């Protein structure tokens, strides 16, 4: 099973050698290439308009780093540090404290947006699906202080939308 190329010869039929001579002096196949390029000229462009139209995607995209909360309930994170244990550049920084109620909680839940690399390990690792990779990707920030997410930054980023995230998970919790 080997199919090799570049084992041929210019056969010395007079029509063959005068066709190679016509190719040398007349540029036939060059005009053939121009014809192919004009055939792609008279097509339509496969473009979009960016501020109006947006490109196709999938529900399993990894975006925003948003948190979630229970239906009429509490913060979904219970500070179990698994996202730090699988964060491959250690952008997850957790310092946890309980409160006087009895349920355990946090103090500090921070992400380096420099060090995030968008695996999916902190989605596949979170045992209650608290941290969820968001749907969108528009950060584009003019300063560098404004890419170090605090806990309440993540809460308002998860409460600016969640029905989006809920729709993505509700569509595709079966596969993963």
């Amino acid at each position: 099973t080997y199919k090799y190329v570049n084992l041929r010869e210019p056969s010395m039929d007079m029509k063959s050698v005068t066709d190679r001579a016509a190719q040398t002096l007349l540029w036939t196949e060059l005009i053939r290439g121009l014809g192919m390029t004009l055939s792609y000229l008279f097509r339509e462009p496969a473009t979009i308009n960016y501020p109006f139209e947006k490109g196709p995607l999938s529900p399993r995209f990894r975006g925003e780093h948003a948190l979630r909360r229970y239906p009429s309930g509490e913060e979904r994170c219970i500070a179990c540090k698994l996202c730090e244990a699988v964060c491959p550049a250690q952008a997850i920084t957790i310092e946890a404290e309980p409160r006087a109620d009895g349920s355990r909680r946090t103090t500090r839940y921070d992400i380096d947006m420099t060090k995030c690399i968008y695996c999916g390990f902190c989605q596949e690792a979170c045992p209650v699906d608290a941290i969820v990779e968001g749907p969108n990707f528009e950060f584009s920030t003019e300063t560098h202080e404004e890419l170090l997410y605090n806990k309440e930054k993540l809460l308002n980023n998860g409460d600016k939308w969640e029905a989006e995230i809920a729709a993505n998970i509700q569509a595709d919790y079966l596969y993963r």
Partner: protein, 95 residues
């Protein structure tokens, strides 16, 4: 839901407020500190407590494979409220 500092700023749900002996107030100049005005404490006590008259009861969090795993909690006091660590919502029994 949130408070107002004696210095004129806000607290979070965690009490991390400042004083006049701090320079992080002067790095908050001109840019409004984002802070969630909807806490996580008051979304539990407002909910009335579920009442199921079994002995060892179940919890998932409202749905299969969406929420927290199957945790079985107990109601074997006379009047105290058993509380799931995952749910954060109490239960009572009716014998």
């Amino acid at each position: 839901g949130v408070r107002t500092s004696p210095t004129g700023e806000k607290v979070t749900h965690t009490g991390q407020v400042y004083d006049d002996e701090d320079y992080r107030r002067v790095r908050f100049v001109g840019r409004q500190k984002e802070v969630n005005e909807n806490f996580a404490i008051d979304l539990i006590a407002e909910q009335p407590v579920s009442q199921v008259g079994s002995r060892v009861i179940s919890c998932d969090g409202g749905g299969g494979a969406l929420g927290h795993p199957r945790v079985y909690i107990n109601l074997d006091k006379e009047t105290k409220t058993g509380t799931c660590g995952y749910c954060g919502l109490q239960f009572r029994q009716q014998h």
